[PDB]
Design a protein around this ligand. Structure first.
Ligand SMILES: C[C@@H](O)[C@@H](C(=O)O)[C@H]1CC(SCCNC=N)=C(C(=O)O)N1
Length: 264
């Protein structure tokens, strides 16, 4: 593990913070781990799991995805580029889910959380798939505070990867819901400088990013489909000690590359 870990330790020292990584080869079972059981703030990365929770609920409530959500101005919070434009008409549950995943739309995220029973409702969904580490405690935007020591609104790289594998490749979602989730992740355009930058262009990637805006705290998780080979699932999370420390997309891409090259 010393030869596995040392390049990650070098990377986080030059970054000036902490990096957590977990990667799983779903064919062979091989893994790469660094700080994989430590907690890191989720920031907007929870929005991918939120869409999965909505899709899972649609397996018990036919027509949930078509349900219209007609909201007022008070539902709008900062960084709501899609939901801001449909204030005059409303949006359906599926349209809000797409916006939360692919634009990180905050109002859409809060509206979907409300449908699920709040942050506690998303945490309960994660428990239902066997994830005991994930916890969402607050709403947008308070969940982005990323204060050192605080376990609220955190998970671990290993738990993120394990849950992502269950939802995108395992049995948690039925085939139509599973392909919708995978398509939302694959079409996400916000992570071109993160895990995607470490992956050969020929290989499809689906990802969800998060960027708290403070404490150098940012992240990305992804499924990678190498051609003609079993997919890889991985998660890369960062944080830093000072409130004004800057996050780095380059550090996330570099850590992703170190993990992908070390699988085997
Ligand atoms: C709300 C804000 O803190 C942040 C988050 O939820 O984590 C929003 C803003 C951003 S927009 C990303 C812009 N990409 C720049 N390269 C993200 C994200 O990283 O997905 N989500």
């Amino acid at each position: 593990t010393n030869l596995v870990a040392e390049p990650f330790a070098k990377l986080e020292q030059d970054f000036g913070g902490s990096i957590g990584v977990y990667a799983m080869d779903t064919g062979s079972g091989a893994t790469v781990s660094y700080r994989a059981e430590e907690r890191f703030p989720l920031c907007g990365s929870f929005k991918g799991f939120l869409a999965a929770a909505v899709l899972a609920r649609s397996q018990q409530q036919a027509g949930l995805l078509d349900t219209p959500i007609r909201y007022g101005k008070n539902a709008l919070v900062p960084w709501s580029p899609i939901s801001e434009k449909y204030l005059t008409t409303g949006m359906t549950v599926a349209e809000l889910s797409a916006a939360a995943v692919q634009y990180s739309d905050n109002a859409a995220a809060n509206l979907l959380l409300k449908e699920l029973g709040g942050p506690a409702g998303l945490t309960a969904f994660m428990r239902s798939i066997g994830d005991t580490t994930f916890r969402l405690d607050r709403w947008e935007l308070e969940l982005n505070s990323a204060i050192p020591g605080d376990a609220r609104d955190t998970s671990s790289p290993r738990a993120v990867t394990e849950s992502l594998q269950k939802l995108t490749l395992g049995s948690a979602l039925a085939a139509p819901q599973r392909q919708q989730f995978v398509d939302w992740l694959k079409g996400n355009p916000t992570g071109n400088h993160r895990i995607r930058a470490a992956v050969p262009a020929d290989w499809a990637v689906g990802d969800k990013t998060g960027t708290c805006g403070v404490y150098g705290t940012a992240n990305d998780y992804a499924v990678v489909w190498p051609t003609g080979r079993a997919p890889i699932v991985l998660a890369v999370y960062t944080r830093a000690p000072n409130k004004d420390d800057k996050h780095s997309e380059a550090v996330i891409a570099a850590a992703a590359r170190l993990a992908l090259e070390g699988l085997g």
